[PDB]
Specification:
Number of domains of chain A: 1
Number of strands of chain A: 16
Bound molecules: (2R)-2-[4-(4-cyano-2-fluorophenoxy)phenoxy]propanoic acid, 2-oxoglutaric acid, manganese (II) ion
Largest sheet of chain A: 8 strands, mixed
Order of helices and strands of chain A: EEHEHEEEEHHEHEEEEHEEEE
Helix content of chain A: 10-25%
CATH superfamily of chain A: Clavaminate synthase-like
Family (chain B): Belongs to the TfdA dioxygenase family.
Function (chain B): Involved in the degradation of the phenoxypropionate herbicides. It can also accept (RS)-2-(2,4,5-trichlorophenoxy)propionate, (RS)-2-(4-chlorophenoxy)propionate, (RS)-2-(m-chlorophenoxy)propionate, however it can only accept 2-oxoglutarate as oxygen acceptor.
Oligomer: homodimer
CATH architecture of chain A: 4-Layer Sandwich
Structural class of chain A: alpha+beta
InterPro entries (chain B): AtsK-like, TauD-like_sf, TauD/TfdA-like
Protein name (chain B): (R)-phenoxypropionate/alpha-ketoglutarate-dioxygenase
Distance between the termini of chain A: 30 Å
Strand order of the largest sheet of chain A: 1-2-3-14-6-16-5-4
CATH class of chain A: Alpha Beta
Cofactor (chain B): Fe cation; L-ascorbate
CATH topology of chain A: Double-stranded beta-helix
Chain lengths: 267, 289
Amino acid sequence: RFERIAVQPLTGVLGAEITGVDLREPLDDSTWNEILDAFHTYQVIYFPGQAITNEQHIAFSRRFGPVDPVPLLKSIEGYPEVQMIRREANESGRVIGDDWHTDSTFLDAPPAAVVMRAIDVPEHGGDTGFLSMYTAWETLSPTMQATIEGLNVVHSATRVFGSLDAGDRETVHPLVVTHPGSGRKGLYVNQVYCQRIEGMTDAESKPLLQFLYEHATRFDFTCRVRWKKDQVLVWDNLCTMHRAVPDYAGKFRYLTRTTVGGVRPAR
Amino acid sequence: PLSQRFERIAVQPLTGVLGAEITGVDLREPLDDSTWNEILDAFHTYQVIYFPGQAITNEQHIAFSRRFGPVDPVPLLKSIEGYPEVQMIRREANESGRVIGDDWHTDSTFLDAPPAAVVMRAIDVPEHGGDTGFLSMYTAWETLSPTMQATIEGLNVVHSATRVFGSLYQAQNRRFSNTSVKVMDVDAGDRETVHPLVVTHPGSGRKGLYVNQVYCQRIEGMTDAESKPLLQFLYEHATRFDFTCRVRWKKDQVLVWDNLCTMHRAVPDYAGKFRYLTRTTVGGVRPAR
Ligand SMILES: C[C@@H](Oc1ccc(Oc2ccc(C#N)cc2F)cc1)C(=O)O
Ligand SMILES: C[C@@H](Oc1ccc(Oc2ccc(C#N)cc2F)cc1)C(=O)O
Ligand SMILES: O=C(O)CCC(=O)C(=O)O
Ligand SMILES: O=C(O)CCC(=O)C(=O)O
Ligand SMILES: [Mn+2]
Ligand SMILES: [Mn+2]
């Protein structure tokens, strides 16, 4: 299909460049449907050359679902929905999201998707990595799949803003989840928020989660997205993970983002 | 700025770590000294460089490679008819065997003198799928703590091809197709050689980590139980995503990678599709501290 937009897949795993559409304008049914189809298929989609306003950013995001900001990020003045991924040139230390993860999985219902918009990015440096948890799951052997399919995992934010109160609040998600849009099964673990496999001792859980982390972040499951000014990107927060790359010390980097609300991860 | 630093070529870095696209040059022609010198500087800085839209012949491919050093074909790969120097990375659309190089490594480090570089040319590649990953072993070394550097900089590592065409390969079931891979002598596969864990690049003068999970067997003098944790950490460290870059291929793209200070990795995400590149290998000298 794709008659209203042009789609250029980035890899054989995930990622696709979308052109032939103006995000500054309202989307008709046929065009929106094609975009949603590509999103469900390619999991991370990006649109070069979309110099959209804050308002148009929010409006595009709302097409995916309710705009429900992530807890920990700072919003731009006048727009609670639009939050900042900002690093000054002078700034030093460690970068936001510089390990493989997906957003806010300590929530009973984590975000469904994130709409990111490049405002000011370096000519090179500051790529974002993404990976497919569909592919991570599908590449596990049938025996391993059957072995871990019924496991549940305890998530909490203790490492991000917890002790290590709301940061210590635990929630339980299935280890393998069915995407409510695509119907497709994907692996659902991440080293940032996952604490233990429910019901297992530390000795039992640690090596299994460790393998899954190593498996999921295999290089051949990833894609690498380069940013340019006015690039608008949407990632699926359920079936992908992402990673920032701190290879731009001394350079200014500024992107905004809206967060699309989701429902309980379900088996 | 690169635009003013380079006068004969144009350089566009791919990441803040390594990789650069090079334009403004015709690899069909002999390169003059000034143009070659700029290319060599860019190669030393960015470690992996590629030239889009270079529709060259097998002879021109060989001629360009020769600027880097003498041609020295890797033992394992088959060559094309009429050109012993030009070897194949070829995968038929219908084969389902082992994909060549689908783990982080650098080429033929089991050799007493592994390759210095490889010049690879896309012949027929998928529209998407089949990217090659690269990483900088300069960066991998430079990001280790001062204490970890002190701890391991004096170590040596045992290399062999045993898992590629030696006893360990023969004892397992995942085999390469005869498309691009020669039948090999098992004893040659098991032959061990010892290289430093940290080497000095002879062109850049920079220190880089020198270990890879394909060919490295153990730290010299250590038991396997002692070696595995250190080596496993180093593999995990070196292959950190932020130390990598990802190259997408297009027909007639010519790429050169530094076989000493980088590692690379095939990506098997193009099942059912034909993929064919050629490559010439540049001979190196014994890795040294
Ligand atoms: C916005 C996002 O919050 C963050 C904020 C910072 C993040 O960076 C991290 C990277 C690695 C690790 C680890 N291990 C922890 C982090 F907090 C990761 C996620 C979210 O989870 O919704
Ligand atoms: C051509 C090249 O030879 C190869 C051929 C295949 C390679 O891929 C692998 C080989 C063994 C193993 C194992 N065990 C894993 C690999 F990814 C890696 C290198 C070379 O080293 O010169
Ligand atoms: O800066 C980036 O590339 C991504 C940072 C991140 O993890 C996020 O915005 O959630
Ligand atoms: O096919 C690739 O992407 C790289 C294969 C490889 O490792 C090699 O040619 O040495
Ligand atoms: Mn994030
Ligand atoms: Mn190789």
